Amino acid sequence: TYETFDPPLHSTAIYADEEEFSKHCGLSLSSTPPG
């Protein structure tokens, strides 16, 4: 897709997938969770 191709409006972007975000957070290292 071209360098000048900059749609102003569109459906949800890949980065905006919070279910994959929260997923990866659970697989990665993090501070302590409730026991």
Partner: protein, 223 residues
């Protein structure tokens, strides 16, 4: 449109019954997975300020409704194309052998296709197809419009899709089966017979989106 008129009557019948105003709502009794849609819009790109509206269907085909009211569809084989003129006349061609007069629209479709594959999440990726759905005739986008709360997509097979911006919920209205598929904020995919939602009731979230849907179908018919 005969299908929009049926859809309106279907929606008026259920909404008039006030399905969420019931002693006991039994929405699950209205589920009919035999009415799952074959096609829905899984991605869309609103470049109508310059080129038009590009979109992906759940079978990974893509299309563009250009600002001149023509449509170009690329099938999921990556080479077969269908061109629909303003007046609905359909013609078939390929990326490899095509009229020279379509080269610019083909190039624009490829930009849309690529922008969607690189940047956008695919909605309904959790729904698996059935045998015999590959022979189904690909619909094209007949018309669309955007509101403060949603984008409304009217497919040539009669189905109307409403994507709500704030919570990512979606309705897929099938007038041929008097059914609706609701994708909730958790991305769960449930398909209901409208007649059974009228009889058994439904929750307030779905009831309100079905009132919204009726407002949008009235708008589509007004245009």
């Amino acid at each position: 449109d005969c299908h929009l008129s049926d859809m309106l009557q279907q929606l008026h019948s259920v909404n008039a019954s006030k399905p969420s105003e019931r002693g006991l709502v039994r929405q699950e009794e209205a589920e009919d997975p035999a009415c799952i849609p074959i096609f829905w819009v899984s991605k869309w790109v609103d470049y109508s300020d310059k080129y038009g509206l590009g979109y992906q269907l759940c079978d990974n085909s893509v299309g563009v409704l250009f600002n001149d009211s023509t449509r170009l569809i690329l099938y999921n084989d990556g080479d077969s194309l269908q061109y629909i003129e303003r007046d609905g006349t359909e013609s078939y061609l390929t990326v490899s052998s095509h009229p020279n007069s379509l080269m610019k629209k083909i190039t624009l479709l490829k930009y849309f296709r690529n922008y969607m594959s690189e940047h956008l999440l695919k909605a309904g990726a959790n729904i698996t197809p059935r045998e015999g759905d590959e022979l189904a005739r690909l619909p094209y986008l007949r018309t669309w419009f955007r509101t403060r709360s949603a984008i409304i997509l009217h497919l040539s097979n009669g189905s109307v899709q409403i994507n709500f911006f704030q919570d990512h919920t979606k309705l897929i209205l099938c007038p041929l089966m008097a059914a609706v598929t609701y994708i909730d904020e958790k991305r769960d995919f449930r398909t209901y017979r409208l007649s059974l939602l009228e009889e058994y009731g439904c929750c307030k979230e779905l009831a309100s989106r079905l009132r919204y849907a009726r407002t949008m179908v009235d708008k589509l018919l007004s245009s």
